[PDB]
CSV table of C-alpha atoms in Angstrom, one decimal:
chain,number,residue,atom,x,y,z
A,1,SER,CA,112.4,128.0,81.0
A,2,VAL,CA,111.8,124.6,82.7
A,3,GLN,CA,114.3,126.0,84.9
A,4,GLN,CA,112.6,129.0,85.6
A,5,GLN,CA,109.4,127.1,86.3
A,6,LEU,CA,111.3,124.9,88.9
A,7,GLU,CA,113.0,128.0,90.5
A,8,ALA,CA,109.7,129.8,90.9
A,9,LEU,CA,108.0,126.5,92.3
A,10,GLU,CA,110.9,126.2,94.7
A,11,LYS,CA,110.6,130.0,95.8
A,12,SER,CA,106.9,129.7,96.5
A,13,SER,CA,107.1,126.4,98.3
A,14,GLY,CA,109.6,127.9,100.7
A,15,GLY,CA,111.8,124.7,100.5
A,16,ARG,CA,114.6,123.2,98.7
A,17,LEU,CA,113.8,121.2,95.6
A,18,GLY,CA,116.0,118.6,94.0
A,19,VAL,CA,115.0,117.0,90.5
A,20,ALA,CA,116.7,114.8,88.1
A,21,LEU,CA,115.0,113.4,85.0
A,22,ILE,CA,116.8,111.3,82.7
A,23,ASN,CA,115.2,110.5,79.2
A,24,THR,CA,116.6,107.1,78.1
A,25,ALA,CA,115.6,107.8,74.4
A,26,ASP,CA,118.7,110.1,74.0
A,27,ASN,CA,120.3,110.1,77.6
A,28,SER,CA,119.2,113.9,77.9
A,29,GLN,CA,118.8,115.2,81.4
A,30,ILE,CA,116.8,117.9,83.2
A,31,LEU,CA,118.8,118.8,86.4
A,32,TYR,CA,117.5,121.1,89.3
A,33,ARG,CA,119.9,121.1,92.3
A,34,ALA,CA,120.7,117.6,91.2
A,35,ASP,CA,124.2,117.5,92.7
A,36,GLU,CA,123.0,118.6,96.4
A,37,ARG,CA,122.4,115.9,98.9
A,38,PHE,CA,119.2,115.2,100.5
A,39,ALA,CA,117.8,112.8,103.1
A,40,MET,CA,116.6,109.7,101.4
A,41,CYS,CA,114.1,108.6,103.9
A,42,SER,CA,112.2,105.6,102.7
A,43,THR,CA,113.5,105.9,99.2
A,44,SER,CA,116.4,104.1,100.7
A,45,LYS,CA,114.1,100.9,100.7
A,46,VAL,CA,114.9,100.2,97.1
A,47,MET,CA,118.7,99.9,97.6
A,48,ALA,CA,118.1,97.5,100.5
A,49,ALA,CA,115.6,95.4,98.6
A,50,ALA,CA,118.0,95.3,95.5
A,51,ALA,CA,120.9,94.2,97.6
A,52,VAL,CA,118.9,91.2,98.5
A,53,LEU,CA,117.9,90.6,95.0
A,54,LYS,CA,121.5,90.8,93.9
A,55,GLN,CA,122.4,87.9,96.6
A,56,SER,CA,119.5,85.8,95.1
A,57,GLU,CA,121.5,85.7,91.7
A,58,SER,CA,124.0,83.2,93.2
A,59,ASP,CA,121.7,81.7,95.8
A,60,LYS,CA,118.4,80.1,94.3
A,61,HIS,CA,117.0,79.2,97.7
A,62,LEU,CA,117.4,82.8,99.3
A,63,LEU,CA,114.2,84.7,98.6
A,64,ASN,CA,112.2,81.7,100.2
A,65,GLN,CA,114.0,81.7,103.1
A,66,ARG,CA,111.6,82.4,106.2
A,67,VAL,CA,112.4,85.1,108.8
A,68,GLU,CA,110.5,85.1,112.1
A,69,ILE,CA,108.6,88.2,113.3
A,70,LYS,CA,108.3,88.9,116.9
A,71,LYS,CA,106.7,91.7,118.9
A,72,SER,CA,110.0,93.1,119.5
A,73,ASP,CA,110.8,93.6,115.8
A,74,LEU,CA,108.1,95.9,115.3
A,75,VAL,CA,109.1,99.6,114.9
A,76,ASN,CA,106.8,102.6,114.2
A,77,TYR,CA,105.2,101.8,110.9
A,78,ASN,CA,104.5,98.0,110.2
A,79,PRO,CA,101.4,97.7,108.2
A,80,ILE,CA,102.5,94.4,106.7
A,81,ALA,CA,104.7,93.0,109.3
A,82,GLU,CA,102.2,93.4,112.4
A,83,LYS,CA,99.8,91.1,110.5
A,84,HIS,CA,102.4,88.3,110.9
A,85,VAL,CA,103.5,88.7,114.6
A,86,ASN,CA,104.2,85.3,115.9
A,87,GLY,CA,104.6,83.8,112.3
A,88,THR,CA,107.2,84.1,109.6
A,89,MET,CA,107.8,86.1,106.2
A,90,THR,CA,110.1,84.9,103.4
A,91,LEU,CA,112.8,87.6,102.3
A,92,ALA,CA,110.7,87.9,99.2
A,93,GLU,CA,107.7,89.0,101.3
A,94,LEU,CA,110.0,91.4,103.2
A,95,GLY,CA,111.0,93.0,99.9
A,96,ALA,CA,107.4,93.3,98.8
A,97,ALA,CA,106.3,94.9,102.1
A,98,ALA,CA,109.4,97.4,102.2
A,99,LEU,CA,108.8,98.5,98.8
A,100,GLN,CA,104.8,98.3,98.1
A,101,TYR,CA,103.7,99.6,101.7
A,102,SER,CA,107.0,101.1,103.0
A,103,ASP,CA,107.0,98.6,106.0
A,104,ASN,CA,109.7,99.8,108.5
A,105,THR,CA,110.0,96.5,110.1
A,106,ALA,CA,110.5,94.8,106.7
A,107,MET,CA,113.3,97.3,105.9
A,108,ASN,CA,115.0,96.7,109.3
A,109,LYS,CA,114.7,93.0,108.8
A,110,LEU,CA,116.4,93.3,105.3
A,111,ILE,CA,119.2,95.4,106.9
A,112,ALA,CA,119.8,92.9,109.5
A,113,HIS,CA,119.8,89.9,107.1
A,114,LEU,CA,122.4,91.8,105.0
A,115,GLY,CA,124.5,92.7,108.2
A,116,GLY,CA,123.9,96.4,108.6
A,117,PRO,CA,123.7,99.7,107.0
A,118,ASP,CA,127.3,99.6,105.8
A,119,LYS,CA,126.5,96.6,103.8
A,120,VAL,CA,123.6,98.4,101.7
A,121,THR,CA,126.2,101.3,101.2
A,122,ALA,CA,128.9,98.7,99.9
A,123,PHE,CA,126.1,97.3,97.4
A,124,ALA,CA,125.6,100.8,96.3
A,125,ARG,CA,129.5,101.2,95.7
A,126,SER,CA,129.5,98.1,93.7
A,127,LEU,CA,127.0,99.4,91.2
A,128,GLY,CA,129.3,102.4,90.7
A,129,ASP,CA,127.2,104.7,92.9
A,130,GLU,CA,129.8,106.7,94.9
A,131,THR,CA,127.1,109.2,96.6
A,132,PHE,CA,124.7,107.0,98.3
A,133,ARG,CA,125.3,106.4,101.9
A,134,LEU,CA,122.9,104.5,104.5
A,135,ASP,CA,124.0,105.1,108.1
A,136,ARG,CA,121.2,104.2,110.4
A,137,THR,CA,118.1,101.8,110.5
A,138,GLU,CA,114.4,102.6,110.8
A,139,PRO,CA,113.0,105.0,112.1
A,140,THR,CA,116.1,107.1,112.8
A,141,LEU,CA,117.3,107.3,109.3
A,142,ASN,CA,114.4,109.8,108.8
A,143,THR,CA,115.5,112.6,110.8
A,144,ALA,CA,116.6,114.6,107.7
A,145,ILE,CA,118.5,117.4,109.7
A,146,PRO,CA,119.7,120.1,107.1
A,147,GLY,CA,123.4,119.7,106.6
A,148,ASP,CA,123.5,116.3,108.0
A,149,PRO,CA,125.2,113.9,105.5
A,150,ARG,CA,123.9,110.7,107.1
A,151,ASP,CA,121.4,108.7,104.9
A,152,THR,CA,121.8,111.1,102.1
A,153,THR,CA,122.3,110.9,98.3
A,154,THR,CA,121.8,113.4,95.4
A,155,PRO,CA,119.0,113.4,92.7
A,156,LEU,CA,121.6,112.7,90.0
A,157,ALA,CA,123.2,109.9,91.6
A,158,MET,CA,119.8,108.4,92.6
A,159,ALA,CA,118.4,108.8,89.0
A,160,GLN,CA,121.4,107.0,87.5
A,161,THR,CA,121.4,104.2,89.9
A,162,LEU,CA,117.6,103.6,89.6
A,163,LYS,CA,118.0,103.6,86.0
A,164,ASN,CA,120.8,100.8,86.3
A,165,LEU,CA,118.8,98.8,88.6
A,166,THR,CA,115.4,98.8,86.7
A,167,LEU,CA,116.5,99.3,83.0
A,168,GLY,CA,120.1,98.6,82.9
A,169,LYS,CA,123.0,96.0,83.9
A,170,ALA,CA,122.8,96.2,87.9
A,171,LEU,CA,120.8,93.0,88.5
A,172,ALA,CA,120.4,89.7,86.2
A,173,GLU,CA,116.9,89.6,84.2
A,174,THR,CA,114.8,87.8,86.6
A,175,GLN,CA,115.9,90.0,89.6
A,176,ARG,CA,115.5,93.2,87.4
A,177,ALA,CA,112.1,92.1,86.5
A,178,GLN,CA,111.1,91.4,90.2
A,179,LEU,CA,112.4,94.7,91.4
A,180,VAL,CA,110.2,96.5,88.5
A,181,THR,CA,107.2,94.3,89.5
A,182,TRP,CA,107.6,95.6,93.1
A,183,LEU,CA,107.8,99.2,92.1
A,184,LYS,CA,104.9,99.0,89.9
A,185,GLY,CA,102.8,97.8,92.6
A,186,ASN,CA,103.6,100.6,95.1
A,187,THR,CA,100.4,101.6,97.1
A,188,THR,CA,101.7,104.9,98.5
A,189,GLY,CA,102.6,107.1,95.6
A,190,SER,CA,99.3,108.3,94.3
A,191,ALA,CA,99.6,112.0,95.5
A,192,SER,CA,103.3,112.3,94.4
A,193,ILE,CA,104.8,111.8,90.9
A,194,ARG,CA,102.1,109.9,89.5
A,195,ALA,CA,99.6,112.5,90.0
A,196,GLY,CA,101.6,115.0,87.9
A,197,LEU,CA,101.6,112.6,84.8
A,198,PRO,CA,98.9,111.5,82.2
A,199,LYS,CA,96.8,108.6,83.7
A,200,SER,CA,97.7,106.0,81.0
A,201,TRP,CA,101.5,106.0,81.7
A,202,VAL,CA,102.9,103.3,83.6
A,203,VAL,CA,104.8,104.2,86.7
A,204,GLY,CA,106.8,102.3,89.2
A,205,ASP,CA,107.9,104.5,92.2
A,206,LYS,CA,109.1,104.5,95.8
A,207,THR,CA,108.0,107.4,97.9
A,208,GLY,CA,109.7,108.7,101.2
A,209,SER,CA,108.9,111.2,103.9
A,210,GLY,CA,110.6,112.3,107.0
A,211,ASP,CA,111.4,115.3,109.4
A,212,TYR,CA,111.7,118.8,108.0
A,213,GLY,CA,108.9,118.2,105.8
A,214,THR,CA,111.0,115.8,103.7
A,215,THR,CA,109.0,114.5,100.9
A,216,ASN,CA,110.7,112.4,97.9
A,217,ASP,CA,109.7,110.1,95.2
A,218,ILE,CA,111.7,108.2,92.7
A,219,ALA,CA,110.1,106.7,89.6
A,220,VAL,CA,110.5,104.8,86.4
A,221,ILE,CA,108.0,105.8,83.7
A,222,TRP,CA,106.9,104.1,80.7
A,223,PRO,CA,104.9,106.2,78.5
A,224,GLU,CA,102.7,104.7,75.8
A,225,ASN,CA,104.7,105.2,72.7
A,226,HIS,CA,108.2,106.4,74.0
A,227,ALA,CA,111.3,105.1,75.7
A,228,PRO,CA,111.1,105.2,79.6
A,229,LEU,CA,112.0,108.2,81.6
A,230,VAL,CA,113.7,108.1,85.1
A,231,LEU,CA,112.6,110.7,87.6
A,232,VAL,CA,113.8,111.5,91.1
A,233,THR,CA,112.0,114.5,93.0
A,234,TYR,CA,113.4,115.2,96.5
A,235,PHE,CA,112.1,118.2,98.6
A,236,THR,CA,112.8,119.4,101.9
A,237,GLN,CA,112.0,122.5,104.3
A,238,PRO,CA,113.7,124.5,107.0
A,239,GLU,CA,111.5,123.8,109.8
A,240,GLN,CA,111.7,120.5,111.6
A,241,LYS,CA,108.1,120.2,111.8
A,242,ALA,CA,107.1,121.3,108.5
A,243,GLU,CA,104.2,119.5,106.7
A,244,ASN,CA,105.2,117.1,104.0
A,245,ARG,CA,104.3,118.4,100.4
A,246,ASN,CA,103.5,115.5,98.0
A,247,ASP,CA,101.6,118.0,95.9
A,248,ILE,CA,105.1,120.0,95.2
A,249,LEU,CA,106.3,116.6,93.8
A,250,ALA,CA,103.2,116.1,91.5
A,251,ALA,CA,103.8,119.8,90.2
A,252,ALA,CA,107.6,119.2,89.5
A,253,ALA,CA,106.8,116.1,87.5
A,254,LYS,CA,104.1,118.1,85.5
A,255,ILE,CA,106.7,120.7,84.7
A,256,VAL,CA,109.6,118.5,83.5
A,257,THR,CA,107.4,116.0,81.6
A,258,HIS,CA,105.7,118.9,79.7
A,259,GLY,CA,106.9,117.9,76.2
A,260,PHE,CA,106.1,114.2,76.2
């Protein structure tokens, strides 16, 4: 009947909804189209940030390395990087900006530092994620064309990988804690998953949006008196210029967490 509710939400919305919830208390799962590919858009930024944190495990100087920001580095959405044109940002600062403000220049800097989109994909494979693929940089990784496999993953794969990154064995403790700190400080997710949950729950999330009204959020959730939940909600539509629908993600989160 959670299934019935998600199916009715999807039908009314006129799009395609993908949901994966992992309850880490018993490793039970609520899945809806969790095996289907969706364009990740900005939710892919988490993997690029994590790949740099993994590097920092063996290179104690990495996170403080400075990167020059020039006018030509700027793409189409740079709320943090534009404040530093002609100056520099550390890799840690780029990580923060990519995740907490969804800065596109910060994402591209991280990808260039790693050596390209294929390097983010190899990082994901090393974590046992055989689904994730990053193919392009910002801003073209957001085209989200139906049936296009580029820059996609599935809700289940992303839920498992986010669990491993934030609560599991993917990163050493210091790096794991840094990633979690970044996600909890996200500024862009108020109208998404967070809006469907009790106000007192602690949430770390990364949103993403793109063409075809593609509207995504992935979250780690710490309830007050229970083990954490991991929740991925992906949503996309059939018209290229469809409006983004953060309210659909909030509604889906309310449905699947009804019971906690």
